[PDB]
């Protein structure tokens, strides 16, 4: 019966509802299990997804909530294409969680009590077109963190506490069109940081306390002037002036160095 296969109480209700069953004590066929390809269970009371490994064809998964820590059983869903993972209280990603999930296109990972991303964590996800690591409370990114993600067209790093970016962080992302850095603590970026992004259509830089002392601000200031169309406001509209210096409130791109 379902409750045997899926020992977590809330995860058993998710599956029961997913299959149109009458109780968590109902038996399930090999057909029913074989044919679930989408599970929707964000903001749930699930603590463990043990049993999920009996659901080989899940392509679409949304999973998350206050009580969740045990996601070890995700590792062998080699068909997972779209994954949204929100373990509110979780502190450590299990060693190599994403290593066998190479068909992943879209990954949203919102795990705010985690604070540090382990290096290598995204190295096997070469088919990612879209990565969202908003709402974590990241103070820094590890070096090389996005390097294998050659196929990314959308990357969202907003609502973090990023104080600086690693030199070269976006250097391998030549297909990137959309890059979100708003609502962090950027004082600056490294010289060259956007130079390789020749496909960039949209960037958002507003709601960072930028430091506008010369000569440091030079690169960013000139960058914003020379891609005045890419730079967008919160309403998605063109707004080169949305990037603003702390204290003073001047537009970053209004700063000209000797």
């Amino acid at each position: 019966p379902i409750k045997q296969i899926f020992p977590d109480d809330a995860f058993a209700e998710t599956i029961k509802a997913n299959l149109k069953k009458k109780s968590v004590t109902d038996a399930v066929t090999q057909n029913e299990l074989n044919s679930i390809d989408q599970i929707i269970a964000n903001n749930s009371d699930i603590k463990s997804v043990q049993g999920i490994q009996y659901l080989p064809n899940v392509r679409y998964l949304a999973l998350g909530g206050n009580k969740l820590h045990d996601i070890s059983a995700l590792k062998e869903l080699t068909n997972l294409t779209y994954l949204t993972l929100e373990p509110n209280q979780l502190q450590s990603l299990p060693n190599g969680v994403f290593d066998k999930l190479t068909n992943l296109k879209e990954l949203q990972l919102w795990a705010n009590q985690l604070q540090s991303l382990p290096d290598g964590v995204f190295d096997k996800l070469t088919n990612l077109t879209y990565l969202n690591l908003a709402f974590n409370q990241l103070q820094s990114l590890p070096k090389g963190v996005f390097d294998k993600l050659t196929n990314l067209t959308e990357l969202d790093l907003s609502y973090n506490q990023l104080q600086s970016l690693p030199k070269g962080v976006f250097d391998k992302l030549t297909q990137l069109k959309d890059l979100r850095l708003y609502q962090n603590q950027l004082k600056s970026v490294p010289d060259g940081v956007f130079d390789r992004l020749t496909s960039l259509q949209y960037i958002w830089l507003h709601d960072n306390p930028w430091d506008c002392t010369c000569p440091g601000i030079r690169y960013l200031s000139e960058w914003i002037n020379k891609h005045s169309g890419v730079v967008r406001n919160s309403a998605g509209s063109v707004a080169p002036d949305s990037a603003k210096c702390s204290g003073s409130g001047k537009p970053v791109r209004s700063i000209i160095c000797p």
Partner: protein
């Protein structure tokens, strides 16, 4: 994706709700107001409840109300001292939100001029009124989001 986009909106609303809750705390810590304005409200006719559900008319209403809340959100700037970064974040994340809802849709804005003078009219009032306006914005923007959240979860 569809599940990706929908998760991403769910998430954005929840972040705004947390914020509102912060401003709430800070405000009725002064007013004790937690128990005319014509603030956007969900009615059964809008298609957002489980009895009378309709994706298309619900979604139009969500987006129209949010766009009407904006001037009330502008009112909210600098009426908060310990929770001001949030006051600002709430204003700014509502914009992002409206932008996500527009990509989701198929087919009506407020006039800036009414809004410029409605805003000076609210800012002109006495301190008790000022706080009473705040508690009602917060309260009704909250109920509005919650209602929007439950319905989007079924679209």
């Amino acid at each position: 994706g569809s599940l990706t986009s929908s998760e991403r909106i769910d998430k954005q609303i929840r972040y705004i709700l947390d914020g509102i809750s912060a401003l709430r705390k800070e405000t009725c810590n002064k007013s004790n107001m937690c128990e005319n304005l014509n603030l956007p409200k969900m009615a059964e006719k809008d298609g957002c409840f489980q009895s009378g559900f309709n994706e298309e008319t619900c979604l139009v209403k969500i987006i129209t109300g949010l766009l009407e809340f904006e001037v009330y959100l502008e009112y909210l700037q600098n009426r908060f001292e310990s929770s001001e970064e949030q006051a600002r974040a709430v204003q700014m994340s509502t914009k992002v939100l409206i932008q996500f809802l527009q990509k989701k849709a198929k087919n009506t804005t407020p006039d800036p001029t009414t809004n410029a003078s409605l805003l000076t009219k609210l800012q002109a009032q006495n301190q008790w009124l000022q706080d009473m306006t705040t508690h009602l914005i917060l309260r009704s923007f909250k109920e509005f989001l919650q209602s929007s959240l439950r319905a989007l979860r079924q679209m």
